[PDB]
């Protein structure tokens, strides 16, 4: 039985750095839309000029 | 003929200067919207990233 608790802990351990790695990677989408929203507010200059 | 003539150059500064000033004064698009490349070229480098 002594084996039980590893492999019950692995999964749980496997799945925290997997969460990790996710918020590692949303970052992407605030930049993109910062990036966005700034350069589109810029754009209005060419209209009101 | 002094009349005719003031007439069809007048006419021709009028013209003139008109696409003068569209064309001088317009031409700042291009410095203007540099950023319509300037940036979106680090949107997509962003991606990778």
């Known amino acids: 039985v002594s084996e039980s608790?590893?492999?019950?802990?692995?999964?749980?351990?496997?799945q925290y750095k997997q969460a990790e790695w996710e918020v590692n990677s949303v970052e992407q989408q605030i930049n993109l839309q910062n990036?966005?929203?700034?350069?589109?507010n810029?754009?209005?200059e060419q209209v009101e000029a | 003929?002094?009349?005719?003539t003031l007439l069809s150059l007048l006419e021709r500064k009028d013209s003139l200067?008109?696409?003068?000033?569209?064309?001088?004064?317009?031409?700042?698009?291009?410095?203007?919207?540099?950023?319509?490349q300037q940036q979106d070229i680090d949107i997509n480098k962003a991606s990778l990233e």
């Open chain 2, 1 to 4: 003929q002094f009349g005719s």
């Open chain 1, 42 to 44: 810029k754009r209005l």
């Open chain 2, 17 to 36: 200067s008109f696409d003068a000033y569209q064309m001088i004064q317009s031409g700042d698009l291009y410095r203007f919207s540099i950023d319509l």
């Open chain 1, 5 to 14: 608790y590893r492999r019950r802990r692995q999964e749980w351990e496997l």
């Open chain 1, 35 to 40: 990036m966005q929203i700034k350069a589109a």
